[PDB]
Design a protein around this ligand. Sequence first.
Ligand SMILES: Nc1nc2c(ncn2[C@@H]2O[C@H](COP(=O)(O)OP(=O)(O)O)[C@@H](O)[C@H]2O)c(=O)[nH]1
Lengths: 51, 430
Amino acid sequence: WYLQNMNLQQIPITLKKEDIKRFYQPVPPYNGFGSEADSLGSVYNLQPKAP
Amino acid sequence: MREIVHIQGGQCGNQIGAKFWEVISDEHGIDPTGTYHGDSDLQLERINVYYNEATGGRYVPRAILMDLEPGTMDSVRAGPFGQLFRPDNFVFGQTGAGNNWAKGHYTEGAELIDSVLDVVRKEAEGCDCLQGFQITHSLGGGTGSGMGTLLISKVREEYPDRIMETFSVVPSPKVSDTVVEPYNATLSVHQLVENADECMVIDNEALYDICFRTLKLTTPTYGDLNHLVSAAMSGVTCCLRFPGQLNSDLRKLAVNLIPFPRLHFFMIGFAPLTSRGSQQYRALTVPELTQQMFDAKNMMCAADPRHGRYLTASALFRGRMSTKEVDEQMLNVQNKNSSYFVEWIPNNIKSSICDIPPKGLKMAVTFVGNSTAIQEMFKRVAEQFTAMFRRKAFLHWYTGEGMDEMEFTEAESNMNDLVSEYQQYQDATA
Ligand SMILES: Nc1nc2c(ncn2[C@@H]2O[C@H](COP(=O)(O)OP(=O)(O)O)[C@@H](O)[C@H]2O)c(=O)[nH]1
């Protein structure tokens, strides 16, 4: 309607959206026990399963 | 000064030494070609304890490897840090003992031990000041249980004033990989109790239990067991190689941990150990170290330490810490667990502190405890022995190679007397 009647195209305007903060937790270093794949199960889940 | 040599025999002894030397090499910062690449100056001041200097600046362990079969040594030649061993020390047989104590102790072992005794004598004469010997074996194998204990006897006959340590893997019925475990175990213990200045038992059941519940790792392996054993082994001798507030050598431990000369059987423990998941979650403090130290489950043996009373205890701390906190924590624990400590000998806990922590850890703890709770392993081993001996089972091999059942009867009587006299002091009161 603005295009034909008013000879004016209406350009919609964007908006800033909500951005949530997220925290990062690093993998602990290798102590020297067992193996990487087997030992990472403990930090991956409470109940460890075979790699 | 006051250095010792390493002597390993049998598959178990060779494989234990294989990663004991690896842990020592990692601690001292030596490359697999023998070139030192460490960072601290303290890493070289006491390197002569375990390493001999050679031309070109390299170092070689004073390790002597023996077996009646060459396969285990040809395999340890393949493992990491296996190129540090001096080739002449490898002594191997051509037949094998077949898990037979008689074969490993009477006919083939007696003939073979001449060369290894020659090289051991050479090593003992070469060193500047001899402190003692450490010998690692398992009681589940015939060649080990015979040849190792016969060499213990021969070395004791020639060096009565030196100290002897034995790293004994006893066969428990839960991890039973052999049916002739208790014949060999009893026959080895009968000779070992007479000659070994110190013995400390290690149980594979305890190793696997530790691996599943403490570390919470799904797939325990021989490597993990050997690494735990090697860490416990190095925890004892760390203070002799590194400075500390209160140095305590193996002779001082022998003085302070053995009240009677026939009571020299120990169980040990190492702290801290945790899963990767709880490594950042946990905090390293003296109270946490001592509570994980004195936990009954943390022991390196399947024996329950709350089923008896501790005769004595020894502690080796690694890391920089205040001595007052350590003393007050030990006093608090000894007051809170008075029911589990014998009453007629007060202050039965020894403390030692070293200022050099292990690589990768800020604090470390080694526990060695002489308690009456070790009687259960001997009782069950003797029960299995008398069960298998009452019907003369599998004795044809043993009787066909020079030894008789009178020796079996004497060994059983001596072991039963040892158990009885070990439990006698448990009920003693002042
Ligand atoms: N820590 C550890 N113990 C082992 C390993 N392999 C076998 N054992 C233990 O050694 C004992 C058997 O010793 P054996 O091989 O018969 O000794 P040998 O006859 O002298 O070779 C058993 O009780 C096993 O639990 C290993 O790779 N690591």
